């Protein structure tokens, strides 16, 4: 029902630098509910299902997109983690409990429950692995993918009645999983290697050949976009599972400009967090526009996405924070470009 522009506008407020990924999610979710509104498919042809795969690097807003999307949509939104999921009958967990969690959010209403969405974080972690002699059995792996795949194909899942008595009572509330959007998001670390090995032309040796230096070899951006089902199978994913997820939203590592906005534009930005911390001590914190550029540059080198920003701030402010409480008559502290490099010390106003 919500227009894609409305969905993109809401995500843009909380997500920065993922315009391409946001477009796919808005279009995909809009088409999904649109199909649910109509019935019989309006023709013999079968309208392909919309299942998104949020593949992206660390700190790229994969979890943020799913969490912020739930706020806009009134439909029930549940979040699960593949790490906890295990084969049925084991101490770890059961995949069927995911449906029960969705009901609790929607008050067990089968009608509205079918219109809910699911976000399975850390999906790559359960990638298929070879057998280990020491381990008794591989509970996590392809076995968990089969249970999740069954829900995508469309199957009714029995749910206990709000924690019924010892006697089962055979309520087994049924909820179809064909119309339930199944979003699976994970950061496939190491996938770049297999993708590069397949699309790498190679460097020639002759005078007229093209030499490829390590500087311009490749990057995570523009490489994951060429992902295909065959490379994902090598990672360990089941081919049937990949086929059931036609929509693929690939994120790119945040740029210097994008990181600069995150430092100040969000309400819960890192800079605002420290400003409030210093304010609790009776001092005000000010960040110069030039300092933000250096912090973004250092964070990009760390390759930890947004989380890298906190490392730079904590390191630069480690010395001042240690001595600032013991110090007196200091009312204002300022940080500049020189402080980020480390050659200079944080400026103090008395």
């Amino acid at each position: 029902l919500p227009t894609p522009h409305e969905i993109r506008n809401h995500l843009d407020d909380y997500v920065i630098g993922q315009e391409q990924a946001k477009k796919v999610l808005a279009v995909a979710v809009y088409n999904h509910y649109k199909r649910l509104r109509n019935g019989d498919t309006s023709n013999g042809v079968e309208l392909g299902k919309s299942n998104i795969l949020l593949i992206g690097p660390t700190g790229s807003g994969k979890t943020l997109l799913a969490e912020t999307l739930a706020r806009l949509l009134d439909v029930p939104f549940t979040m699960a983690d593949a790490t906890t999921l295990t084969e049925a009958g084991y101490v770890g967990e059961d995949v069927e409990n995911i449906i029960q969690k969705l009901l609790q959010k929607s008050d067990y209403d089968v009608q509205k429950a079918q219109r809910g969405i699911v976000y399975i974080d850390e999906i790559d972690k359960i990638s298929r692995k070879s057998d280990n002699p020491s381990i008794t059995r591989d509970v996590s792996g392809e076995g968990v993918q089969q249970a999740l795949l069954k829900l995508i194909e469309g199957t009714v899942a029995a749910v206990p009645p709000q924690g019924g008595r010892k006697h089962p009572q055979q309520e087994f509330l049924q909820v179809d999983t064909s119309k339930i959007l199944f979003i699976c998001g994970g950061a496939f670390a190491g996938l770049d290697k297999v993708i590069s090995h397949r699309v790498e032309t190679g460097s020639g040796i002759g005078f007229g050949a093209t030499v490829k230096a390590k500087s311009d070899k490749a990057s995570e951006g523009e490489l994951l976009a060429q992902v295909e089902p065959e490379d994902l199978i090598k990672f360990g994913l089941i081919p049937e599972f990949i086929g059931r997820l036609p929509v693929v939203a690939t994120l790119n590592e945040l740029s210097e400009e994008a990181l600069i906005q995150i430092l100040k534009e969000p309400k819960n930005a890192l800079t605002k967090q420290y400003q409030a911390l210093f304010n609790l001590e009776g001092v005000d914190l000010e960040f110069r526009d030039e300092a933000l550029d250096a912090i973004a540059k250092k964070a990009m080198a760390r390759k930890t996405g947004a989380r890298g920003l906190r490392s730079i701030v904590e390191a630069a402010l480690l010395d001042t924070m240690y001595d600032l409480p013991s110090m007196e008559d200091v009312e204002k502290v300022v940080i500049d470009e020189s402080v980020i490099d480390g050659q200079s010390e944080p400026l103090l106003i008395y």
Partner: protein, 192 residues
Amino acid sequence: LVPMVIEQTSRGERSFDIYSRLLKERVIFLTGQVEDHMANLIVAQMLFLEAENPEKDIYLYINSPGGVITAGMSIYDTMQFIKPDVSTICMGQAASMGAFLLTAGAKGKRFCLPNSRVMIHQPLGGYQGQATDIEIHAREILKVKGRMNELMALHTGQSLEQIERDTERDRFLSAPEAVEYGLVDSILTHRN
């Protein structure tokens, strides 16, 4: 006979000749009289290393009494063409062609050993035949003399006139004298 050495890597032990093992470390050996066949071998090594890593610097150990000019130009053009900087080290001696290649190295990366002996002379050639043909070959070699001197002046930094005066007759320069002339930048006395 060339001795063989064993290189230990994660893949496993590998056997290389003493020259190939150094080639893996971006080291090319220029030894003996310069000629067409040896020059093509050096050219193939420069191109091969360029592909492996065009950023790292290549090293060239020059110990030769000189040779053919045409073969040397193939090496000189190859060095300037490829992106990697070529570091030239003089061991034992470096004659006219060896010196031209020595000074042709990357600015700041040209080295020479203390007891090395450098010699630079003008090109020498000869032709037998009709007077008309002599005038042609005589003009061609003069062009090479001027062309070679123009390139030496660029790397050494000396004036073209100064190069012409010194190259008129065989001139022997020691390692410290070469530094002043501009053929090399520094001397490698001891490992630091």
